[PDB]
Amino acid sequence: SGFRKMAFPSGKVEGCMVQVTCGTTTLNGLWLDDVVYCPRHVICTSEDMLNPNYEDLLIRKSNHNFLVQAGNVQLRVIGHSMQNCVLKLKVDTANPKTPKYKFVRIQPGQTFSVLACYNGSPSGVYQCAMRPNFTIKGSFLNGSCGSVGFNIDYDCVSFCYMHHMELPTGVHAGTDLEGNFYGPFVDRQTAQAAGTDTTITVNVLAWLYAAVINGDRWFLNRFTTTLNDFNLVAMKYNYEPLTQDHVDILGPLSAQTGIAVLDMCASLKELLQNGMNGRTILGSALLEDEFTPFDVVRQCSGVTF
């Protein structure tokens, strides 16, 4: 028993991290087979970040302007192109430690592990949710650009995020591995605001189930509710509406505990209306929304990779 914010083992992604330098700008790249993927803003100077013309910037660079280092070994660049916000550097050596992988775009509410890196080397690993407003609440400093987020599904690494920037509010924004930003953001130092964030209701339910599985039961009550009545309440508190799809995804946890989803919803309703009321759940005094139902199944069933 016990329930922790738990990240995927990072070794398969660690062996893909390299350093990419262009001019005096250094960040991280991801080396899969004979290509290094990194954020395109590596090619900017500060004379460019007002209103960068990336195509034009890239035209002026040659292969020899890109220094890629894999530990001590320099990897020679033999081609460059840009796919949306990601620079693809072809190199003269394919990475022998390339895992089985795919590129996926995650949806709001879903979670992934981030391997935070500086200078092509790993700093630490932690779990993040894609927020409903398409930001993440990570831990990144200058030079972390190109750090990636990922899930491991069976034997396969699913890369879903590359870090590009911090917003003025202190939250973080980035792209999928095909270079498309999550949300309404661009890779420019311009004033950029996110939508208003919302609480990921399905995940809060997941976490309440986790709590029951691990013996925290005080918030349970005899009441049950309807999807409509639940949503009337929850939406006042800036919670995402719960849909039938979400109820279905909670099935394994309702099965495990024998607490119907609409029964747990009446617990959540009471928690919203009366607060945590001086108690804790799984070591927290707030309702936690960054575990998905799949995260709970994974951790409580001991899935391996």
């Binding site: 960040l27 400093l141 030079g143 920037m165 911090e166 003025p168 890779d187």
Partner: peptide, 4 residues
């Protein structure tokens, strides 16, 4: 200098 937030483009990381």
């Amino acid at each position: 200098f937030x483009l990381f």
